[PDB]
Design a binder for these strands. Sequence first.
RNA 1: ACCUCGAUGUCGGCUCGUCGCAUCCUGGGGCUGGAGCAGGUCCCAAGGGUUGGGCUGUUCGCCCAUUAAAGCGGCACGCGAGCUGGGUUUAGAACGUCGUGAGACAGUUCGGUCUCUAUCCGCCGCGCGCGUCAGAAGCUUGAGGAAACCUGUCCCUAGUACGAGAGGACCGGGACGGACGAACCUCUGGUAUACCAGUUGUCCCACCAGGGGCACGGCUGGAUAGCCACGUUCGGACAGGAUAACCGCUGAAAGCAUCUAAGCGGGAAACCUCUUCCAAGACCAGGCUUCUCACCCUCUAGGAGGGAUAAGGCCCCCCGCAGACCACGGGAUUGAUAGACCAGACCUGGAAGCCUAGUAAUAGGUGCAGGGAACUGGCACUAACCGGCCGAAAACUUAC
RNA 2: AAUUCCUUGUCGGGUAAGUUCCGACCUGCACGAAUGGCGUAACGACUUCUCAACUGUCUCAACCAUAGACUCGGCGAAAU
RNA 3: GUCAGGUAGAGAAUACUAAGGCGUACGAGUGAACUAUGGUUAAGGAACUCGGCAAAAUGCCCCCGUAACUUCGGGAGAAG
Lengths: 214, 113, 118, 54, 122
Amino acid sequence: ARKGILGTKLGMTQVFDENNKVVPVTVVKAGPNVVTRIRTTERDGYSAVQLAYGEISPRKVIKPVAGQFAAAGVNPRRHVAELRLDDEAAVAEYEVGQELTAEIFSDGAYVDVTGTSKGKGFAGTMKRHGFRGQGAAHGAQAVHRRPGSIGGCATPGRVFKGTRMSGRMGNDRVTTQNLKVHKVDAENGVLLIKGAIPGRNGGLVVVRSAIKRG
Amino acid sequence: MNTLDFVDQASLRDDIPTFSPGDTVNVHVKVIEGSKERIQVFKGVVIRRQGGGISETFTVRKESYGVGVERTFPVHSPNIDHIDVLTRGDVRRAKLYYLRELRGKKAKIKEKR
Amino acid sequence: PKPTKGPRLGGSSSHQSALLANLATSLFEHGRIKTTEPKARALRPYAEKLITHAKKGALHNRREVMKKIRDKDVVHTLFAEIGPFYADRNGGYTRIIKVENRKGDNAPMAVIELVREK
Amino acid sequence: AVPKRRMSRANTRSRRAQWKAEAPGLVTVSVAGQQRKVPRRLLKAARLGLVDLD
Amino acid sequence: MIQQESRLKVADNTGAKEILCIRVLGGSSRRYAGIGDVIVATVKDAIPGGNVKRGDVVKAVVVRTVKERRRADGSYIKFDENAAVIIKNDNDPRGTRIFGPVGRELREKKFMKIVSLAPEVL
RNA sequence: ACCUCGAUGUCGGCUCGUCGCAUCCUGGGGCUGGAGCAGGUCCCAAGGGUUGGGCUGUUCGCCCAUUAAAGCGGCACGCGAGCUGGGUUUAGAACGUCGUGAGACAGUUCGGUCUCUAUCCGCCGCGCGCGUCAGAAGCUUGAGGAAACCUGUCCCUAGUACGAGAGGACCGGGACGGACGAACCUCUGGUAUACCAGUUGUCCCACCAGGGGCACGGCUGGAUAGCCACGUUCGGACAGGAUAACCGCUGAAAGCAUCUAAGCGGGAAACCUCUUCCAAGACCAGGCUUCUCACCCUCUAGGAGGGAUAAGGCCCCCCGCAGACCACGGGAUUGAUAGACCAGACCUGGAAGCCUAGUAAUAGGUGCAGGGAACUGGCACUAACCGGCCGAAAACUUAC
RNA sequence: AAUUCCUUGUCGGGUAAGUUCCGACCUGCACGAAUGGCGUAACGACUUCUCAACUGUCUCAACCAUAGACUCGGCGAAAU
RNA sequence: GUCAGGUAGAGAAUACUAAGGCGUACGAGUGAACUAUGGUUAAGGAACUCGGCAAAAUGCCCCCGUAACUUCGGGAGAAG
Ligand SMILES: [Mg+2]
Ligand SMILES: [Mg+2]
Ligand SMILES: [Mg+2]
Ligand SMILES: [Mg+2]
Ligand SMILES: [Mg+2]
Ligand SMILES: [Mg+2]
Ligand SMILES: [Mg+2]
Ligand SMILES: [Mg+2]
Ligand SMILES: [Mg+2]
Ligand SMILES: [Mg+2]
Ligand SMILES: [Mg+2]
Ligand SMILES: [Mg+2]
Ligand SMILES: [Mg+2]
Ligand SMILES: [Mg+2]
Ligand SMILES: [Mg+2]
Ligand SMILES: [Mg+2]
Ligand SMILES: [Mg+2]
Ligand SMILES: [Mg+2]
Ligand SMILES: [Mg+2]
Ligand SMILES: [Mg+2]
Ligand SMILES: [Mg+2]
Ligand SMILES: [Mg+2]
Ligand SMILES: [Mg+2]
Ligand SMILES: [Mg+2]
Ligand SMILES: [Mg+2]
Ligand SMILES: [Mg+2]
Ligand SMILES: [Mg+2]
Ligand SMILES: [Mg+2]
Ligand SMILES: [Mg+2]
Ligand SMILES: [Mg+2]
Ligand SMILES: [Mg+2]
Ligand SMILES: [Mg+2]
Ligand SMILES: [Mg+2]
Ligand SMILES: [Mg+2]
Ligand SMILES: [Mg+2]
Ligand SMILES: [Mg+2]
Ligand SMILES: [Mg+2]
Ligand SMILES: [Mg+2]
Ligand SMILES: [Mg+2]
Ligand SMILES: [Mg+2]
Ligand SMILES: [Mg+2]
Ligand SMILES: [Mg+2]
Ligand SMILES: [Mg+2]
Ligand SMILES: [Mg+2]
Ligand SMILES: [Mg+2]
Ligand SMILES: [Mg+2]
Ligand SMILES: [Mg+2]
Ligand SMILES: [Mg+2]
Ligand SMILES: [Mg+2]
Ligand SMILES: [Mg+2]
Ligand SMILES: [Mg+2]
Ligand SMILES: [Mg+2]
């Protein structure tokens, strides 16, 4: 079944292969998770496992949230997320209260990493959509970065939905597929993933076994 | 102090000599051709050292057959075996990019005495 | 300290440098000044780094302070009075207190003070 | 670009209703024995006598 | 990092001195030629005695670039000049001698004869 | 000559696109005067792709290098309240030509003001309100949308099939690329207006020394964080379903024959799934849970009106790599949220003072020195407060 | 040809590629001798073509500062 | 129209500054897009475009050294 774990992006560094090739890696704190809830086709209509991650003072947890952790018999955690599972045999592999660690993965496995991309604020069309903008000279009047035309004429006499324009950019859910796990550090609880993963350092990510190359 | 020091410490190499920009060095580089593996020496002047930890790099400049060549290495690269320092230089700055424009006698660096 | 993220106080980097220096001088001379809240918040770290040089006390530290404070009388006060007074306190030499907005432009105003308690 | 038509009474008022002040939240402070109301932002200054309670 | 209209010194004894890059080969819209990439070029300057005269259209392979090139090991190579060797359709030089050092990349790109004749390969 | 002359601005280029298929490439096929390679022609197919230069105001066209290919058209010959203004088509001037002349020329030549603070619809983003039959909170299903969809070369199979030879495969495997998109900052590279160093002119701090102000940050050499591309990593599947052209099986009407009339099958980058993202204002306003589940007063005993609360929330406060505002995320003394402070990392490159050498400019020692932001870890010294405002249930029918 | 409609005439030069440019040919639609003809050193913010140097003009765009834009307080228009 | 301080400098240019005079009448905030005005830029270097438009570049003093052509003055600060 499709393994997965919640974690925190720690930062990027560099390691060397055994054939001396350089490998850029992002370090993911694949911290211990606890199974807080199991979704079943008979209760919920679908199969999934609910995971909890990150330390939290019980002073900070709101009472209805504490009630759900109490019903599960586990200490509250900051972040709760579901991993969707295809079938009930996969659900059977999990039990409430059970702890998951980085060691669910092995070196050379392919993972998909999901995170929130960095915020870019209100972005122009050149930055947000890669518009070419206009000439810096040859008479061009105050349109160096302007988007140009946004439609035809009397027909259709309107701007189509989906027309690319300026606006808020970033802070989106992004999944990067088929990243190689270079190393698993069981002692530090860390994944070294080759390549980039979405998000700022310290941000929540979800590491799952790759659908396409799993 | 770095967040990822506990990862990088595993790859840090211990046989690195101390050297500074302006020193003449001999960098023994592993090179593969076919199946045989040999060592090729790159002799020149260290013109810069930037970064830190396992990502620190240094750049060596040589004049070869009338053509300037610069070679940049990860300090802790396992593709290097020996770095041998030959002369200490007298320089007044961390980055020796001005050497890129100089030739011959004027490109020479003063030695430590 | 951490540079201003947005546009500088005074409408230029050079005016901001002069403004911070003048505000520090005033703060040390009187012990308490009232200004706009952004200026007060910008002054706090700048003034505290100067007080640190004063606590160190050496000739080197004095010259460093003089790079920003041109009032020699205030420099004397920093090294003979304010410095010694804070010898045992590790950071936190100033306090910011929010006060009433200014009438003519509704500018938020703050008082910044040297801490006297200990 | 100029307005094409006059704006209906209703449309004007709907937009114009968004131009309004919001009341400051006020807290009580005892000064000179009397209890006055001041913004929570000014609570510390009012006890220190830095606020002109007219 | 060579492109159309970039001029390169000639690194062999064919008799050309400068070539002008006309097209980087190896795909539609391909922007940049690096070490080991084949270009089409015109001869802009020639030695009076040369076998190849000014205005001839020739094929050449880039052997030196000013823009630093990354290697698998995380190392970099950089030269003070851009230089190309005039090639024929069998990847052999048209000249008999190669001047100056060449990049390792030529070996990966199968220009063995050029690697052989180069005074140094770096 | 039907709308517009109380105004609907033109060619070409630029920017941004969107649609058709009469298809340029890639995909699937029938027939060939198809041996093979490579084609000819016709059928099906619009998912994606469809280069950069020389000449000309040009469109067009010719040419030079490439490419899998450098498609044809519609949208006021798309797009000037988005840009340009070279051509044309105001006023100046000149040539040829015509005119007695004033002048004229789908003849030519040089020059010649491109205005507007967006009300409405529309589009890209972001809030506030109310609703989803008590008030709240965590995690969710996915009706329905959006995005993505390109392709080469070389090496095996194989110098095999085919072929006199020359030449040279289908199908099936593997490696390495071009273009494009996304995320990201370890590396490379760019930037740096409170970082460090050098240095010119001048004024100042009485003066020397050491510094500061101004001259683009005066200039020059570097430069962590942030942002970023020239950088790094990853992507386009794999499989299934229903089909197009086409190939059929089994078969009558019509003793034969026929893919079709009853029935049963193969079959493509198009379609539906599959991959990524949005998504219950999806008014059929969903689901699985958890928390609060409580009280006073007035009208009349109907329904309401008001006040105080619970869970929770908001505002104020300390902030953020979150940000136009707002929102969002975190912290709020039972506290490391920000600053300071201490230490490290990193950047700069050897401070001042003193001593020594030199006539001096200057050099050396003290000393990986001194200075310093963003990154990391400690540390309640400073500020996060002796607090305000919101916020919980008419009933009734049938089934069990 | 500041004159040539046909016309991007034809040949030569320059460029990888030149409807422009330079040198020629004469088939001058429709040159020509004080509405002067043909030249000419010097001169030109004239017009035209080529080269070196140089560069964000461009490949291809990134980052910084300031003035607006944006937020808060005050005053407070306009075309339509 | 009349006075013309000082240090650099050929100078009444320009930079800083003395005497003297001002801060001149909306402000306070804030790293949005976008526009304006300045700044820097890897590799390439006119490929931009009607056209090198706009930028960049050259720039001072003292020596050396300067072609075609010419109306004999020039060209000429040629160029380097
Ligand atoms: Mg304008
Ligand atoms: Mg402009
Ligand atoms: Mg260093
Ligand atoms: Mg900044
Ligand atoms: Mg301002
Ligand atoms: Mg300045
Ligand atoms: Mg009629
Ligand atoms: Mg009208
Ligand atoms: Mg068709
Ligand atoms: Mg499709
Ligand atoms: Mg049109
Ligand atoms: Mg229009
Ligand atoms: Mg006229
Ligand atoms: Mg006449
Ligand atoms: Mg003009
Ligand atoms: Mg004209
Ligand atoms: Mg005209
Ligand atoms: Mg759906
Ligand atoms: Mg709908
Ligand atoms: Mg992006
Ligand atoms: Mg970094
Ligand atoms: Mg400084
Ligand atoms: Mg003095
Ligand atoms: Mg002095
Ligand atoms: Mg001054
Ligand atoms: Mg600088
Ligand atoms: Mg620099
Ligand atoms: Mg619901
Ligand atoms: Mg709010
Ligand atoms: Mg012609
Ligand atoms: Mg010709
Ligand atoms: Mg001619
Ligand atoms: Mg005449
Ligand atoms: Mg006559
Ligand atoms: Mg006459
Ligand atoms: Mg005349
Ligand atoms: Mg003029
Ligand atoms: Mg502003
Ligand atoms: Mg206002
Ligand atoms: Mg003077
Ligand atoms: Mg002046
Ligand atoms: Mg006035
Ligand atoms: Mg003002
Ligand atoms: Mg701004
Ligand atoms: Mg550049
Ligand atoms: Mg450069
Ligand atoms: Mg061009
Ligand atoms: Mg062009
Ligand atoms: Mg042209
Ligand atoms: Mg110009
Ligand atoms: Mg300039
Ligand atoms: Mg001349």
